[PDB]
Curated annotation (Swiss-Prot):
Domain of life the protein comes from: Eukaryota
Lineage, highest ranks first: Eukaryota, Fungi, Dikarya, Ascomycota, Saccharomycotina
Subunit structure: Component of the RNA polymerase I (Pol I) complex consisting of 14 subunits: RPA135, RPA190, RPC40, RPA14, RPB5, RPO26, RPA43, RPB8, RPA12, RPB10, RPC19, RPC10, RPA49 and RPA34. The complex is composed of a horseshoe-shaped core containing ten subunits (RPA135, RPA190, RPB5, RPO26, RPB8, RPB10, RPC10, RPA12, RPC19 and RPC40) where RPA135 and RPA190 form the DNA-binding cleft. Outside of the core, RPA14 and RPA43 form the stalk that mediates interactions with transcription initiation factors and newly synthesized RNA.
Location(s), subcellular: Nucleus, Nucleolus
The protein, known as: DNA-directed RNA polymerase I subunit RPA190
Biological role stated in the UniProt entry: DNA-dependent RNA polymerases catalyze the transcription of DNA into RNA using the four ribonucleoside triphosphates as substrates. Component of RNA polymerase I (Pol I) which synthesizes ribosomal RNA precursors. Besides, RNA polymerase I has intrinsic RNA cleavage activity. RPA190 and RPA135 both contribute to the polymerase catalytic activity and together form the Pol I active center. In addition, subunit RPA12 contributes a catalytic zinc ribbon that is required for RNA cleavage by Pol I.
Family: Belongs to the RNA polymerase beta' chain family.
Miscellaneous field: Present with 2840 molecules/cell in log phase SD medium.
Length: 55
DNA sequence: CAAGTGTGAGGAAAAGTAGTTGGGTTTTTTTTGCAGTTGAAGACA
């Protein structure tokens, strides 16, 4: 309530956007779209990093 | 052997006052949350 009324902050702490999905949109299509929009960082795919510094 | 004028000081004491000190206040003139904002360096056409 403070984040709205008191500060009218243009930076919500947890900004969310709700998306209605068409009646025709399957649940499986919906999970595909959920994957399709979410961000994927390069870190998120790395398993191990080995640096062999030789000098 | 003796009696008789003139007279200077020595002495005492309670309270005060000295010396030496101190006390004594008096009197005294280690960010722990927040959101915003400016100015800055840097950068651009």
């Amino acid at each position: 309530l403070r984040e709205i009324v008191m500060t009218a902050s243009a930076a919500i702490k947890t900004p969310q956007m709700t998306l209605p999905i068409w009646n025709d949109v399957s649940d499986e299509q919906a999970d595909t779209f959920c994957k399709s929009i979410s961000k994927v960082l390069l870190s998120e795919v790395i398993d191990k990093v080995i640096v062999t510094e030789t000098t």
